[PDB]
Amino acid sequence: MVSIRRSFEAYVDDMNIITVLIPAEQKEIMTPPFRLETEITDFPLAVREEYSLEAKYKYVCVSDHPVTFGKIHCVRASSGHKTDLQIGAVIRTAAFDDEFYYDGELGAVYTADHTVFKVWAPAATSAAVKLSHPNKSGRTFQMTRLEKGVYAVTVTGDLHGYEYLFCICNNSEWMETVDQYAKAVTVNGEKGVVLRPDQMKWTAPLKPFSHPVDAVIYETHLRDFSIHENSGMINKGKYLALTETDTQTANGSSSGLAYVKELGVTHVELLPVNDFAGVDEEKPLDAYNWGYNPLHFFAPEGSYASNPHDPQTRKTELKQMINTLHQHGLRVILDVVFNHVYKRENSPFEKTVPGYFFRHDECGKPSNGTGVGNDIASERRMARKFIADCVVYWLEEYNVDGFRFDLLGILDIDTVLYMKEKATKAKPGILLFGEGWDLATPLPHEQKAALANAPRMPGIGFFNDMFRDAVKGNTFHLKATGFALGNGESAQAVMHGIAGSSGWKALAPIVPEPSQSINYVESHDNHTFWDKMSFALPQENDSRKRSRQRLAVAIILLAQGVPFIHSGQEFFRTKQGVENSYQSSDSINQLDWDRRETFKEDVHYIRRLISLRKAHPAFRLRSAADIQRHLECLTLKEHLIAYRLYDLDEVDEWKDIIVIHHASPDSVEWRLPNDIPYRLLCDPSGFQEDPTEIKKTVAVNGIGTVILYLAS
Ligand SMILES: OC[C@H]1O[C@@H]2O[C@H]3[C@H](O)[C@@H](O)[C@@H](O[C@H]4[C@H](O)[C@@H](O)[C@@H](O[C@H]5[C@H](O)[C@@H](O)[C@@H](O[C@H]6[C@H](O)[C@@H](O)[C@@H](O[C@H]7[C@H](O)[C@@H](O)[C@@H](O[C@H]1[C@H](O)[C@H]2O)O[C@@H]7CO)O[C@@H]6CO)O[C@@H]5CO)O[C@@H]4CO)O[C@@H]3CO
Ligand SMILES: [Ca+2]
């Protein structure tokens, strides 16, 4: 780790304060008065304070005129020595932000005639764009500094297909980096690429989605979803797999697009499709990764494309996949990672404006609330601009229908509300939700976009961890059990979740409205419900485990709120006991289409539960007030919960609906709240083809759900 030889050090830690560090053994030589020099500049520096450090003597100096960025500055000691004025913590100040905030567009602005290149590098002193092209002439042009610390250069000619990089000079060190706003990149994202608009046409217009509680989210990874040999899809592990119609397994069961459509899901949530690190796009089968290692936020991941070498190909295919899903009435949700980047030190952010895009602790070191190395400082104005810019771009360029914010809690509320405004204006009805876990990131608690602040973020949903653990059992204790696994201690919390988690008697609200409660019992994180239950219930047979998992599904799917289903959950997806499969092999992560065949009947139960929810608005009340007015608990025991939806005049096709969840293998009788004859729609055996009529009482045999309804 070599470096530029310097007499001593000097940094701009604030708009008008320069910190001078002098090596210990030079303390009596390199001494005050110090002066700031530049072009015509040469002013005095007042010493506000001075004190010794481990191996240096420090001076906190003050300048009369605020430092002017973009020009190389020199600080001179009385001894005559000099050093270049480097960048300090000044970059993270509100004053710096307000002085250089730029509201225009950044990146490569293409025209067949010419391309304008723009990059925000306020603390830099020089910048250039580096152009290269497969077997063609490479050229590097100096860029000019305009207002708001923006560097630009216009290159005449058609730059389509041209690769580009930015060279940014900070603290006299030039760094090469990919444009933060790169909309196309080379294999493995080594360089950005300029491409003319692909003229993609969206031919499947969708009306704005009605309301969150009307959705059914299906979480899937593009590789997992079709990589299995028996998947029935040609483009295994690629964007195009989901475009294949009427595919089926070897035995003839539905698979792929046809399958997802058949299940009745409304939104397909995809794990990260922006370019990420972790899979060598040159040898994709050699490694696996969920994709939570952000490299380029504005470009698609290359391992999911048929050809990662051709810049345009991945864009074409992701857009086709999305358009096709839309043709078949399916919407798309993008998992986005604006809480951190892969390898902060070599990131486009850090190489362009050192120390600006990442939060630091009170000691000046990069914070690590995300737990993976760095926290993007969303509150910095150009960061907020970036996240908002990115969200609107994926909506406009890729026509998606919503976003799942990975570690939403790391983002600040103002940024979230700022992007929400722009996002909903660009696409009414889109879903916006995420994991608002409270994390140790340097932000006042009321500013975190966490669950605890849900009241200030209307229109934003949160994964309901309370409802999740209430049903399944604590996810951080293998043996911990939930209601569905037989623990009566969580029955009340479960009832609360069934009511939308917007307040239940002595229980404080989890979220203000049900549209903000993302209800689920499984996701890509942690053990699958099946493996979790398997650890907590070591002595239970497969048949009973299956009834319990189907039971958890009924609870979630018949609960007020927004149902969320992990891909494969419908058929007891197992990961061989692996808790965190972020980099595990395909044998571990693949969607097992063989298992989907084996348990096609169970899958069918989930399908009927979804159809039930869709056919009856009683399960989809839009407000905590309506719920308070149509939902009531009739029984709450350790293994038995019964609730009913009433006064469904012009709400539901049915007059009254009773749902009973039983979490024990024994048999029991349950008295209805009246003597009117009801229809037995479902029981532990599953939905009944021709609903028989029962009266006053009903048998609840074993683990499962019994549904009764009264037509009007
Ligand atoms: O950080 C190490 C941690 O990493 C992995 O867990 C991830 C997880 O995959 C993410 O989903 C997310 O989790 C969220 C939860 O979803 C959310 O509910 C909440 O979690 C709270 C729990 O609900 C609550 O019960 C309690 O958890 C206790 C827990 O019962 C204790 O057992 C103990 O947990 C320790 C784990 O046993 C240990 O493995 C490790 O955790 C790993 C985890 O295994 C891995 O899958 O360390 C923890 C130490 O805390 O203590 C906790 C807390 O007292 O409280 C939590 C806190 O809200 O929030 C989390 C995120 O904070 O993120 C985790 C973290 O990476
Ligand atoms: Ca990649």
Domain ranges of the chain: 1-101, 102-196, 197-622, 623-712
* Smallest CA separation from ligand 1 atom 26, residue: 476
Ligand nearest to the CA of 279: 2
Q: Whose CA is nearest to atom 2 of ligand 1?
A: 371
Three-state DSSP string of 515-583: HHEEECCCCCCCCCHHHHHHHHCCCCCHHHHHHHHHHHHHHHHCCCCEEEEECCHHHCCCCCCCCCCCC
Nearest CA to ligand 1 atom 42: 476
Choose which CATH entry (2.60.40.2320, 3.40.50.10320, 2.130.10.10, 3.20.20.70) describes domain 1-101: 2.60.40.2320
CATH topology of domain 623-712: Immunoglobulin-like (2.60.40)
**Whether CATH 3.40.50.300 fits 102-196:** no
Which atom of ligand 1 has the smallest separation from the CA of 465? 18
477 pocket-lining for ligand 1 (C-beta < 6 Å): yes
How many angstroms separate the CA atoms of 56 and 11, rounded? 14
Ligand 1: residue whose CA is nearest its atom 33: 476
The reply to whether 102-196 shares the fold of 1-101 is yes
User: For every residue of 102-134, which 3-state class applies, written as one string?
Assistant: CCCCCEEEECCCEEEEEEECCCCCEEEEEEECC
Residues with catalytic function: 406, 435
Q: Which residue has the tokens 């539901």?
A: 652
**Residue 535 beta carbon below 6 angstroms from any ligand 1 atom:** no
Cα 590 to ligand 1 centre (Å): 25
What is the CA(346)–ligand 2 centre distance, in A? 15
CA–CA distance, 271 with 525 (Å, rounded to integer):
11
The β-bridge relationship of strands 86-87 and 150-156 is unpaired
Contacts of 481 (CB under 8 A, 6+ apart): 473, 487, 536, 537
Considering only CA atoms, which residue is closest to atom 54 of ligand 1?
476
Q: Can you say whether the dihedral through the CA atoms of 7, 11, 16, 22 is positive or negative?
A: negative
From CA 384, how far away is CA 674, in angstroms rounded? 57
Contacts by residues 91-95 (CB-CB < 8 Å, ≥ 24 positions apart): 91/122, 91/123, 91/353, 91/354, 91/355, 91/356, 92/355, 92/356, 92/360, 92/377, 92/380, 93/14, 93/15, 95/14, 95/15
Token look-up 């998947």 returns: 231
The secondary structure of 318-368 as a DSSP string is HHHHHHHHHHTT-EEEEEE-TT--SSGGGSHHHHHSTTTSB-B-TTSSBP-
Which ligand 1 atom sits nearest the alpha carbon of residue 463?
16
Q: Residue 198 and residue 390: Cα distance in Å, rounded?
A: 19
Residue 18's Cβ-count burial label (10 Å; 0-12, 13-18, 19+) is buried
For residue 363, give every residue at least 6 positions away whose Cβ sits within 8 Å of its Cβ, in sequence order, or none: none
Residue 329 burial class via C-beta count within 10 angstroms: exposed 0-12, middle 13-18, buried 19 and up: exposed
52 CB neighbour count, 10 Å cutoff = 10
675 exposure class (CB count in 10 Å sphere: 0-12, 13-18, 19+): exposed
Q: Is 580 in the pocket of ligand 1 (CB under 6 A)?
A: yes
Q: Using CA atoms, how far apart are residues 97 and 101, in angstroms rounded to an integer?
A: 6
156 SS3 class: strand
Task: Write down the residue that tokens 């050809």 correspond to.
Answer: 307
Tokens of 236: 């295994």
State the Cα torsion 103-107-109-112 to the nearest 10°: 180
Q: Whose CA is nearest to atom 51 of ligand 1?
A: 476
From the CB of 526, is ligand 1 less than 6 Å away?
A: yes
569 lines ligand 1 (CB under 6 A): no
How far away, in angstroms, is 107 Cα from ligand 2 center? Answer: 20
In the three-class reduction of DSSP (H, G, I as helix; E, B as strand; rest coil), residue 311 is classed as: helix
Indicate if ligand 1 lies below 6 Å from the C-beta of 479: no
CA–CA distance, 303 with 288 (Å, rounded to integer):
10
Q: b/e per residue, 636-664, with b = 16+ CB within 10 A?
A: eeebbbbbbbbebeebbebbbbbbbbbbe
d(CA 20, ligand 1 centre) in Å: 44
Tokens (6 digits) for 385: 């601009």
Q: Which of 467, 476, 526 to mutate to test the pocket of ligand 1 (most atoms within 8 A of CB)?
A: 476
Distance 412 CA to ligand 2 centre (A): 28
CA distance 565 to 610: 11
What are the contacts of 304-308 at 24+ separation with CB within 8 A? 304/222, 304/223, 304/237, 304/238, 304/239, 304/273, 305/238, 305/239, 306/235, 306/238, 306/240, 308/187, 308/188, 308/281, 308/282
197-622 homologous superfamily: Glycosidases (3.20.20.80)
SS3 661: strand
